[PDB]
Each structure stands twice: as C-alpha cells, then as structure tokens.
Design a protein around this ligand. Structure first.
Ligand SMILES: *[C@@H]1O[C@H](CO)[C@@H](O)[C@H](O)[C@H]1NC(C)=O
Lengths: 50, 45
C-alpha cells in the first residue's frame, strides 16, 4: 500500500492485527517483527484548478 | 477456534460480555461429537 505510517492511540487487542474504517479498508497494521501499531493514512491529494 | 471470556457476576445473567478470540488451531480433522472433562479427587479414606 501507499500511505503515511504514524503512531496510533487505538487500543488494539492482542489478537487484532489489521484496522479498518467504515469502508472495510486497511487503516492500521501491526508488524510481526516489532509488535507496534502503525496507523495508515492515505497521502495528501486534491484537485488542481487553474 | 476457541473464544473465551471471564465475567464477574453477582439462570444466565443479563447484559453483554463479548468473548474474545483465544486461539485458532490448524487442526484439519472431522469433529462431530464432544464431551466435557471433569476432575475428581481421590478420597484416601
Ligand atoms: C522476530 O519476530 C517475532 C515475531 O514475529 C518477534 O516476537 C521478535 O521479537 C522478532 N525479533 C526481534 C529481534 O525483534
């Protein structure tokens, strides 16, 4: 995926890995190598009007 | 899949207590019957 990985304050349970929004799209990930939660946010984008 | 929960209570009680996922075991066998195991103590008398 393409996104920004940030620190999170979401209290994931030990079984929980992924995180999802209302769209059932990945919003957080728990890394196997280091057991920390990385919030995934899509990078900044917008429309350009001339 | 085994799910578990421990709930402090004062019939089955009211209210909600969601059972958290405890273990997923890759067994791959056919299961149609089950039985509970109890512990019994020797009397020594
Ligand atoms: C390697 O991964 C395991 C689980 O994925 C983890 O428990 C362990 O801490 C990792 N090793 C190091 C040096 O972080």
């Amino acid at each position: 995926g393409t996104g920004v990985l940030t620190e999170s304050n979401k209290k994931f349970l030990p079984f929980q890995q992924f995180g999802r929004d209302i769209a059932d799209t990945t919003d957080a990930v728990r890394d196997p190598q280091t057991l920390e939660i990385l919030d995934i946010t899509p990078c900044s984008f917008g429309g350009v009007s001339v | 899949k085994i799910y578990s929960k421990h709930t402090p209570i004062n019939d089955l009680p009211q209210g909600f207590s969601a059972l958290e996922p405890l273990v997923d075991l890759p067994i791959g066998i056919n299961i149609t019957r089950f039985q509970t195991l109890l512990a019994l103590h020797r009397s020594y008398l």
